[PDB]
Amino acid sequence: GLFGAIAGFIEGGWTGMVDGWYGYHHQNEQGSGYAADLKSTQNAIDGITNKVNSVIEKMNTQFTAVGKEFNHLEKRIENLNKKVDDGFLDIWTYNAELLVLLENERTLDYHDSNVKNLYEKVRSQLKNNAKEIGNGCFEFYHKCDNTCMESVKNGTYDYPKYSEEAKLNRE
Amino acid sequence: GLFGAIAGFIEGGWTGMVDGWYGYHHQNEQGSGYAADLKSTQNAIDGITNKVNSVIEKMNTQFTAVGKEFNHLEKRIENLNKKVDDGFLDIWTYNAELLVLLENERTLDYHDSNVKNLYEKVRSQLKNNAKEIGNGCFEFYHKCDNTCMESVKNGTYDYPKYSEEAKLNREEIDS
Amino acid sequence: GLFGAIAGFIEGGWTGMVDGWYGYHHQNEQGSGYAADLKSTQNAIDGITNKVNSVIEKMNTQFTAVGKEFNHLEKRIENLNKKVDDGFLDIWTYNAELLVLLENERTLDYHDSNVKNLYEKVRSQLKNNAKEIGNGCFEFYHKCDNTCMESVKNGTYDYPKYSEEAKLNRE
Amino acid sequence: DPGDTLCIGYHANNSTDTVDTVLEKNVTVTHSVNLLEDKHNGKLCKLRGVAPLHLGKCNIAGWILGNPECESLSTASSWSYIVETPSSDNGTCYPGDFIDYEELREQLSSVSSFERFEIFPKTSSWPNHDSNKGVTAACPHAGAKSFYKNLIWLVKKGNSYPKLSKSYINDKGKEVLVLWGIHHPSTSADQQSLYQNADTYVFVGSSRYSKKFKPEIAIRPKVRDQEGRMNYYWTLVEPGDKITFEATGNLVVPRYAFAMERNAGSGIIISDTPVHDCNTTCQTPKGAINTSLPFQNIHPITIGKCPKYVKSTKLRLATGLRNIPS
Amino acid sequence: GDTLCIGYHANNSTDTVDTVLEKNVTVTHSVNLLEDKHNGKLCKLRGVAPLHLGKCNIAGWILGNPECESLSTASSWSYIVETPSSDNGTCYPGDFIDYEELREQLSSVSSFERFEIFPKTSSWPNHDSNKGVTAACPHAGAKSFYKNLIWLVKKGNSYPKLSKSYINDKGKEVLVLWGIHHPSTSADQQSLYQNADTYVFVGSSRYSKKFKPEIAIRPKVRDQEGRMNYYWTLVEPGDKITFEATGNLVVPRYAFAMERNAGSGIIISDTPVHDCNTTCQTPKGAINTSLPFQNIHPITIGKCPKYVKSTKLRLATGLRNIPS
Amino acid sequence: GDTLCIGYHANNSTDTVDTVLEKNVTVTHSVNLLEDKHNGKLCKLRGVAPLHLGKCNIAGWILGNPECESLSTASSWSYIVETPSSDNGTCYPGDFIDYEELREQLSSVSSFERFEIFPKTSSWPNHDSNKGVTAACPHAGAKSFYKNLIWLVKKGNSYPKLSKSYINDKGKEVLVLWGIHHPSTSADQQSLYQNADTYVFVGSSRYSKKFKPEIAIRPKVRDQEGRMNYYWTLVEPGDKITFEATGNLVVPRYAFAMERNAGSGIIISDTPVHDCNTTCQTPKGAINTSLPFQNIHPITIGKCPKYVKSTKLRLATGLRNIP
Numbered sequence A, C: 001g002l003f004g005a006i007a008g009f010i011e012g013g014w015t016g017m018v019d020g021w022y023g024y025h026h027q028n029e030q031g032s033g034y035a036a037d038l039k040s041t042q043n044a045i046d047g048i049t050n051k052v053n054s055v056i057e058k059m060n061t062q063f064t065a066v067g068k069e070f071n072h073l074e075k076r077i078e079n080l081n082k083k084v085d086d087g088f089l090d091i092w093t094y095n096a097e098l099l100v101l102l103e104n105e106r107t108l109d110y111h112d113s114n115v116k117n118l119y120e121k122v123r124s125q126l127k128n129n130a131k132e133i134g135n136g137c138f139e140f141y142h143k144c145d146n147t148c149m150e151s152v153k154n155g156t157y158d159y160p161k162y163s164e165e166a167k168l169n170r171e
Numbered sequence B: 001g002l003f004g005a006i007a008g009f010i011e012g013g014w015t016g017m018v019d020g021w022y023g024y025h026h027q028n029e030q031g032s033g034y035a036a037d038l039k040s041t042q043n044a045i046d047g048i049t050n051k052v053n054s055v056i057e058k059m060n061t062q063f064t065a066v067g068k069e070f071n072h073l074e075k076r077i078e079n080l081n082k083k084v085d086d087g088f089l090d091i092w093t094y095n096a097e098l099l100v101l102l103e104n105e106r107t108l109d110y111h112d113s114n115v116k117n118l119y120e121k122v123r124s125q126l127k128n129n130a131k132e133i134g135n136g137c138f139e140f141y142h143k144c145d146n147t148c149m150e151s152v153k154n155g156t157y158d159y160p161k162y163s164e165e166a167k168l169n170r171e172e173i174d175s
Numbered sequence D: 001d002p003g004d005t006l007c008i009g010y011h012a013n014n015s016t017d018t019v020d021t022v023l024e025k026n027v028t029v030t031h032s033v034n035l036l037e038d039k040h041n042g043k044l045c046k047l048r049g050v051a052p053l054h055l056g057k058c059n060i061a062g063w064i065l066g067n068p069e070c071e072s073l074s075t076a077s078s079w080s081y082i083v084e085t086p087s088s089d090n091g092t093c094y095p096g097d098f099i100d101y102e103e104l105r106e107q108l109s110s111v112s113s114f115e116r117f118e119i120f121p122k123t124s125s126w127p128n129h130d131s132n133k134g135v136t137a138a139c140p141h142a143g144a145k146s147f148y149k150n151l152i153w154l155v156k157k158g159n160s161y162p163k164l165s166k167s168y169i170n171d172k173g174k175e176v177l178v179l180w181g182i183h184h185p186s187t188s189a190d191q192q193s194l195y196q197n198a199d200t201y202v203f204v205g206s207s208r209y210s211k212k213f214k215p216e217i218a219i220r221p222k223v224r225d226q227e228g229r230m231n232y233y234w235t236l237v238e239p240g241d242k243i244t245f246e247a248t249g250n251l252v253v254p255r256y257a258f259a260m261e262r263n264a265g266s267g268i269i270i271s272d273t274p275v276h277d278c279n280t281t282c283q284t285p286k287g288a289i290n291t292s293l294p295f296q297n298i299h300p301i302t303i304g305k306c307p308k309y310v311k312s313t314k315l316r317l318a319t320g321l322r323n324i325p326s
Numbered sequence E: 001g002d003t004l005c006i007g008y009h010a011n012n013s014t015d016t017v018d019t020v021l022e023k024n025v026t027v028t029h030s031v032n033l034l035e036d037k038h039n040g041k042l043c044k045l046r047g048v049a050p051l052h053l054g055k056c057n058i059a060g061w062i063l064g065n066p067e068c069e070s071l072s073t074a075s076s077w078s079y080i081v082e083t084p085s086s087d088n089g090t091c092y093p094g095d096f097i098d099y100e101e102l103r104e105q106l107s108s109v110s111s112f113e114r115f116e117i118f119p120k121t122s123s124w125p126n127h128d129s130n131k132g133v134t135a136a137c138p139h140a141g142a143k144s145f146y147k148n149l150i151w152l153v154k155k156g157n158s159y160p161k162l163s164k165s166y167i168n169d170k171g172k173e174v175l176v177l178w179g180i181h182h183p184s185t186s187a188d189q190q191s192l193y194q195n196a197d198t199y200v201f202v203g204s205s206r207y208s209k210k211f212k213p214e215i216a217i218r219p220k221v222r223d224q225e226g227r228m229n230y231y232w233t234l235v236e237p238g239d240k241i242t243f244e245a246t247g248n249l250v251v252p253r254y255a256f257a258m259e260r261n262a263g264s265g266i267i268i269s270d271t272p273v274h275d276c277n278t279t280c281q282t283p284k285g286a287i288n289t290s291l292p293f294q295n296i297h298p299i300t301i302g303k304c305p306k307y308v309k310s311t312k313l314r315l316a317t318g319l320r321n322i323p324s
Numbered sequence F: 001g002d003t004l005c006i007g008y009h010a011n012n013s014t015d016t017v018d019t020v021l022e023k024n025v026t027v028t029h030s031v032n033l034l035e036d037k038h039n040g041k042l043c044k045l046r047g048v049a050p051l052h053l054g055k056c057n058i059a060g061w062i063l064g065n066p067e068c069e070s071l072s073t074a075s076s077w078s079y080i081v082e083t084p085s086s087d088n089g090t091c092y093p094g095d096f097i098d099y100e101e102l103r104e105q106l107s108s109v110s111s112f113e114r115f116e117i118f119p120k121t122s123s124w125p126n127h128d129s130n131k132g133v134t135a136a137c138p139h140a141g142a143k144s145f146y147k148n149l150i151w152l153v154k155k156g157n158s159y160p161k162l163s164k165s166y167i168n169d170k171g172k173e174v175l176v177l178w179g180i181h182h183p184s185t186s187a188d189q190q191s192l193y194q195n196a197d198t199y200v201f202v203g204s205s206r207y208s209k210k211f212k213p214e215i216a217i218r219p220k221v222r223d224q225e226g227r228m229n230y231y232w233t234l235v236e237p238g239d240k241i242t243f244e245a246t247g248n249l250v251v252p253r254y255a256f257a258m259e260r261n262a263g264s265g266i267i268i269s270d271t272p273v274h275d276c277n278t279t280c281q282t283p284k285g286a287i288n289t290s291l292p293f294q295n296i297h298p299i300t301i302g303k304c305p306k307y308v309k310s311t312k313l314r315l316a317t318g319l320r321n322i323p
């Protein structure tokens, strides 16, 4: 994908993470488990919901009757009416088909970007207190208990608190 | 946003930087200041100008009189004419509303990308000689006067020139 | 520009890599040369082919005859027929023009992303066993023979195999 | 010594939904929504909360003239559209042309008010002419010769058809739809036997309408056993305005007229689809559509506030991401 | 330590735009794609003023309804303007044949010259060209008639066969209009034309029609139980048009040499005319814009932006505006 | 040290495309979406050749103008071609009623057969069917007339009432055409038809019209001060058409059994017809493309790309080209 995360450096999805689109798996001495990142998930939901509603609600037509009746000496205008109906048909069909194709690529890129960004937000907090081991995973150079893990997830990881322990293990 | 910079790791904008869209704030002993990156800014101005002009200018209509008059026994062709007018209306309205929604997103993504690319160009130069302290800022492990600052901005920063001073401070700082 | 690689941190293209869109140049003791990454290229070819085919094939017109003939006392309906042909002309001309402008930008973004991702995949494997020397190049801190080079292109580079040797030259 | 770990990842699930993207067909995604309405209720429904006028085995001509076969139909004082069936062929049982028929049909398509009234009462209007003998085998009712209910085929009384003059002033406060016919006998004998006078005219006028009719006597190919023809005409009399009829023969005179108020832009559906006590905002000939979706592939010819018709079979929009379970 | 930060512009902008993911995003810079204002004037199109018909409509104007005599008529015009209250038309009731077609034909004209096709003073020595006046067509309270036509009436007790030809020597198309009179009664027929059973014939190289008066009482419009039908045709340069009649002919007096240009239309509006130029006119005001869309009016004349239902089409140019 | 570089293809392509941010970007590969080529021929559509009328228009061809005799008419055609100088039509001046409708009806035909609906030798025992020629319709300099109509004239001093019927047993629609003659003078009326006051009536189950001759001197066209109007109707299978007249009727001689197909049209062009097939025909040549857009001509027949005012629609497939 465009942003290299989904089906990219993070090779697969998690059926085990049921409560959101993006998030975390942690493993420390007090246990392990999946947890959705609710904020990035909710932003994405709000965004996509807005997208679907825009695609839907921007179409607001007036009350109209498409049918027309012409007698056997009005074939030219009957054919004209047909040209109008057929013309609209070709436009709406082409535009609807392409719109879906193009916006689907964009929707998928968007999720890829959200995942990429989530990963970068963690990488940036942890710096060298953890090791990037691939597949979207970090291995800590220090014990990271639930309080620590929670702090990573809400962007308040305290790097200096753990830097000494991490340094020792890293060297 | 899509590239993670604007309203992302770079949390807000600078009302103080008036001379351009993207740029720099430095602070050293000789003082502090804002300065736009003129090249990235101008590339974006040209790009967006081309985008605006494209949207506008690709619409080149011919002289036309929309109105038609029908008598009381021509209700059907009158209604046919109305179908035509209303059909064009539904098409243009929907396409214009979606064109704008979609392209506005693309325009903001574009800015986000430019800010991200600018950030990464600096990161690439500084590497080890500076600490990424988040919010888009780099804190140098060495003294960086105006000349040095200016070198980073025009992409001629001399990493080996300062690496030794940086190495010492960095390792000292990290005990 | 969108992804920072093409015409970005990788300034120019390679007229010497003739067998693909993206790829590698290596120099080691047993040789040097260009080689396209066939997989990343093929994916892009398949993707772009699908894209062209979509823009072309989603237009499926029926058999129609555009022309209409009107006599001197049917000027109003002749002008209605003209408003129809001209309305369609305006829609299609505008839509085709924007479609091309917009998607050309996306195609170029796409290539940029593919190059960026290729570059990132190498960077993530090599870590500090090589030096990122800009312009999309890595200078190995260890001897990298053809087997090694291939492991890098393959995404199976063995960091710990070379980490001691690398750390020595990197000091 | 293996350190604690934190992994960043994305949802996968059991969804088999696929979507097409510009780069790749049939991509499986975790969530998606359809943009294409492909479902209808197989019913002809009320539009704007008003039922359609269903004509049964009659077409609009049979209904508005009062073809004997249409007398069984119920006509509400209003309707949102009209339904004929593909086999509805009870129309002009006496052959001829219905002038500006398609225009009348468009005008009658929706009506907010519609009240029949005896414009020229049968029992008091025609003391100098015969208003009982104008029946024909071409328009049978209970196997007996009959005629349209809304018109009277006036015929000579005794051996005299004196000049007829008759007027109506529209005191209804709304448009009055008036219909009449002009009879064109097969022969000069038929002309005499019906109207006595050999050389006749009919004249019909309002402030707006004005036309003189001259019967065109000739043997046309038999249709419903008739070698003659009857042409049907209509006009809308403005409130306050007057319509006059003048004739020395060959005038199929109005009996009932219609005070009405036409209602905007509707149409006529021709279909076997059954009517039903259901409400809709979008009606197609094969069923009503109830959706907020922008596109539909049910039918190009719709009435109401409708989704745009497309040739597509599938317009599926991804909402979730690429679904990649273990 | 010394610091260098990367960042982006913020300013005082309160402009919002909608995006596919989010509504009302405040951006630093934006441009409107929607033209939503007009100048409240009816302007010149192609640099040519419209023909304004004041309280007359095209029928009244082209026939020379006495109430339209005061209108000025240029030799060219880019479109026609009527007012919604313009109903001085056919002051003698009847049908104007192919009226809408004529209106469309006349909507824009590069050249237009009224001329006396059949001079009143010399053309009709054997008929009365003075008595053809009517209370239905008053001029200053006096009975009158259309300026461009003459209601020929019997001279004494005689209406001899009329025959009169005109050859188009104007080097351009000539619009000829005439009327056919349908009296209310046989008495009225005799009183006007003497002959009880009359016809009118009009013929050119491309037009040919015989008319038969239809005598009957119509409901009184403008006090008249009779009717007058109005007909028109375009005689090509060099072609002859012939009038033949034994009664009931409202003959041409003035006709019109003209050169039709392309196709404009007719604006019906109370909006006042003005000495301004425009390239796109709506019924309620001209619009000057390079913008591709407009929500002013669907019915426009000229090279116009597409009409849309939108109230706001604001394209972002700058970035999200996030001050302090 | 040993090196590995990531890069991308460049070549000697000069192809440019426009993008939303930048005009004229040079790319390594691209494809055209716009068809701007045609073969300059008028071809067979649906594998069926068009009917080419030469210097005749449809009115001349369908009435049988003497100058249209040498034209060949297939029993089927996909569309009709007239040239801009095709002026042989109604040689005797007058109006062709619902002529545009007829052209539209005849534009494409899956089956078309001329037959003699009223044989010249046996149909008119009480009328003269051999004097109906005119200098208005010369053939080889001699006075002649339309092939498919007969201009009946009085026989001796008499034009008795004519009544002639035809029942359509062709199993398909029959196109019947006829004329009404409008003499310049009373004297001309009498010389041709004897009877001063005449009518023509044409009727079917569907059609019913009485025509009255209008006698007057019109300005001369092709030396005629009189006029002839032309009419047509389509007789449904199993239906009867009846002609009745006391003068002034130009009776059908040949009529046309036909089966119309779908929606084609008429091309007016000097462009030569050629033995080639196409799926999309323009007046200036045929188009063979899969592309969705074309700038050749707005007026097309077939399964055609959408007409656009575009001069260039180039789609990037490859990369920005930076050699």
Ligand SMILES: *[C@@H]1O[C@H](CO)[C@@H](O[C@@H]2O[C@H](CO)[C@@H](O[C@@H]3O[C@H](CO)[C@@H](O)[C@H](O[C@H]4O[C@H](CO)[C@@H](O)[C@H](O)[C@@H]4O)[C@@H]3O)[C@H](O)[C@H]2NC(C)=O)[C@H](O)[C@H]1NC(C)=O
Pocket (backbone or CB within 6 Å): F023, F024
């Ligand atoms: C990207 O490429 C496009 C394609 O070429 C290019 O658009 C072109 O711009 C040039 C401007 O140099 C246009 O050339 C002009 O077109 C007008 C229209 O007919 C002519 O009248 C002009 O002739 C006069 O002007 C000349 C320039 O001063 C004089 O030297 C000359 O004597 C005449 O007085 C002139 O030819 C050209 O029409 C367009 N091309 C198309 C296909 O429209 C665009 O500028 C390029 N953009 C970038 C950023 O490179």
Ligand SMILES: *[C@@H]1O[C@H](CO)[C@@H](O[C@@H]2O[C@H](CO)[C@@H](O)[C@H](O)[C@H]2NC(C)=O)[C@H](O[C@H]2O[C@@H](C)[C@@H](O)[C@@H](O)[C@@H]2O)[C@H]1NC(C)=O
Pocket (backbone or CB within 6 Å): D014, D015, D016
């Ligand atoms: C994805 O897996 C879940 C969990 O098994 C499925 O939901 C289960 O559906 C069964 C019915 O077959 C029901 O008895 C279980 O209670 C329900 N489990 C949960 C946790 O909700 C789900 O399939 C189904 O979901 C339910 C809610 C029902 O609507 C059914 O129609 C639907 O198919 C699986 N999804 C798919 C697409 O297979």
Ligand SMILES: *[C@@H]1O[C@H](CO)[C@@H](O)[C@H](O)[C@H]1NC(C)=O
Pocket (backbone or CB within 6 Å): D048, D049, D050, D277, D278, D279
């Ligand atoms: C339809 O709507 C009307 C109101 O207009 C209501 O009275 C009626 O009960 C509704 N019927 C159904 C089936 O919704």
Ligand SMILES: *[C@@H]1O[C@H](CO)[C@@H](O)[C@H](O)[C@H]1NC(C)=O
Pocket (backbone or CB within 6 Å): D067, D068, D069, D089, D090, D091, D092, D093, D138, D139, D140
């Ligand atoms: C009604 O239709 C039936 C079937 O088409 C027909 O046989 C019958 O004669 C018609 N009756 C009238 C009065 O038109």
Ligand SMILES: *[C@@H]1O[C@H](CO)[C@@H](O)[C@H](O)[C@H]1NC(C)=O
Pocket (backbone or CB within 6 Å): E011, E012, E013
């Ligand atoms: C906002 O700032 C601009 C300068 O960029 C200034 O010119 C403009 O007038 C300001 N708007 C207001 C309302 O002060």
Ligand SMILES: *[C@@H]1O[C@H](CO)[C@@H](O)[C@H](O)[C@H]1NC(C)=O
Pocket (backbone or CB within 6 Å): E044, E046, E047, E275, E276, E277
């Ligand atoms: C309008 O334009 C014409 C030429 O197109 C010019 O002669 C005239 O002076 C202009 N008038 C105004 C008011 O701009």
Ligand SMILES: *[C@@H]1O[C@H](CO)[C@@H](O)[C@H](O)[C@H]1NC(C)=O
Pocket (backbone or CB within 6 Å): E065, E066, E067, E087, E088, E089, E090, E091, E136, E137, E138
């Ligand atoms: C014109 O003025 C009003 C508007 O119709 C009307 O009352 C009057 O009779 C008209 N006069 C003529 C001559 O048309």
Ligand SMILES: *[C@@H]1O[C@H](CO)[C@@H](O)[C@H](O)[C@H]1NC(C)=O
Pocket (backbone or CB within 6 Å): F012, F013, F014
């Ligand atoms: C590119 O190279 C090929 C190699 O044969 C050559 O044929 C062609 O002329 C070149 N194209 C351009 C644009 O010069």
Ligand SMILES: *[C@@H]1O[C@H](CO)[C@@H](O)[C@H](O)[C@H]1NC(C)=O
Pocket (backbone or CB within 6 Å): F065, F066, F067, F087, F088, F089, F090, F091, F136, F137, F138
């Ligand atoms: C055929 O056309 C030529 C000129 O194109 C004309 O001179 C000739 O009289 C025409 N013949 C007929 C029979 O229409």
Ligand SMILES: *[C@@H]1O[C@H](CO)[C@@H](O)[C@H](O)[C@H]1NC(C)=O
Pocket (backbone or CB within 6 Å): F046, F047, F048, F275, F276, F277
């Ligand atoms: C199309 O034309 C070709 C030659 O131009 C011919 O051989 C072939 O029979 C045609 N195809 C059909 C199906 O008529």
